[PDB]
């Protein structure tokens, strides 16, 4: 009946979160099995290819690692740099380690962010990896090491770890394998970002979500339709990704079109019209086009 932004429970992540303090810097890390993962820039703000030598001479005793939930202080026996992350081997194996997987996220997919400070998850919110490989999140200093995750039956799927904030208040990081999303690095210098592009699949889901919870026949809904092929020709010149961005999203979108009794061609023409006729209309509780509603999460909460 009601379609909301669903988040995954953060208890599993909370039990694995730890604080990492190397001399001056203090950030967060995740502790899985006998390994603690955390951003590498905790040992200094370096650049390019000096990380190998800087990490290789980093003292294990300078790493103060504490698990606040379990009240356990950890001791680092080895240090390994995997990508832009540090893999700190510890003596104690985390008994709270769940069945986990390191899954890289494709753009347009959602994930829950466990924003943590001093090893304690303070806030939890929902983001979607945008087509520029950035997330639009909310972080302060000391929040690096916070993880983005999803769940699938007691199995924790870690997708992200926070590293850097850009001046436009966009955020970037790595997967849990150490590789950044996009062409961004953990350096405090000007880095060019590709122009913004709307994940059309998600924008379609947001409009469908409004039709199923707020107004089935709103005044901004197009009385006209446009083919997918004609929409994609318009989308190339209006910062909208080619539809569909994921072929698997078509089954969810077709299901939404049958439930709302509005074909996707009407939604796509509404998107085009809203580019010039929106005039501040609130759509699914937002004043602009959002990529935060995925077709799967909207279809999973819909009738029939």
């Amino acid at each position: 009946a009601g379609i909301k932004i669903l988040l995954h429970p953060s208890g599993v992540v909370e039990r694995c979160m730890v604080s990492v303090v190397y001399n001056g810097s203090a950030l967060n890390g995740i502790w899985l099995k006998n390994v603690v993962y955390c951003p590498r820039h905790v040992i200094g703000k370096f650049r390019g290819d000096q990380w190998t030598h800087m990490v290789s001479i980093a003292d294990c005793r300078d790493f103060i690692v504490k698990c606040p939930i379990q009240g356990i202080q950890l001791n680092v026996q080895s240090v390994k740099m995997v990508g832009a992350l540090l893999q700190l081997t510890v003596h104690t194996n985390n008994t709270a380690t769940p069945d986990y997987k390191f899954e890289r996220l494709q753009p347009g997919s959602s994930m829950t962010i466990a924003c943590a400070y001093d090893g304690i998850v303070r806030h939890v919110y929902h983001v979607v990896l945008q087509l520029n490989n950035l997330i639009y999140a909310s972080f302060l200093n000391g929040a690096c090491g916070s993880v983005g995750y999803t769940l699938k039956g007691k199995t924790l799927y870690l997708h992200y770890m926070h590293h850097i904030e850009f001046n436009n208040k966009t955020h970037s990081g790595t997967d849990l394998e150490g590789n950044f999303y996009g062409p961004y690095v953990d350096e405090e210098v000007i880095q060019q970002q590709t122009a913004f592009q709307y994940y059309t699949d998600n924008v379609v889901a947001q409009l469908y979500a409004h039709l199923l919870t707020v107004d089935a026949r709103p005044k901004w809904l197009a009385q006209s339709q446009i083919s997918i092929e004609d929409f994609n020709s318009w989308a190339a010149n209006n910062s909208f990704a080619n539809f569909p961005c994921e072929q698997t999203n078509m089954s969810y979108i077709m299901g939404l079109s049958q439930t709302a009794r509005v074909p996707v061609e009407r939604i796509l023409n509404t998107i085009i019209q809203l580019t010039t006729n929106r005039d501040g209309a609130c759509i699914m509780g937002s004043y602009d086009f959002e990529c935060d509603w995925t077709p799967e999460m909207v279809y999973n909460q819909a009738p029939i």
Binding site: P39, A143, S146, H163, I164, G173, E188, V189, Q191
Partner: peptide, 5 residues
């Protein structure tokens, strides 16, 4: 133009 968290 960018800052480490």
């Amino acid at each position: 133009x960018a800052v480490l968290x």
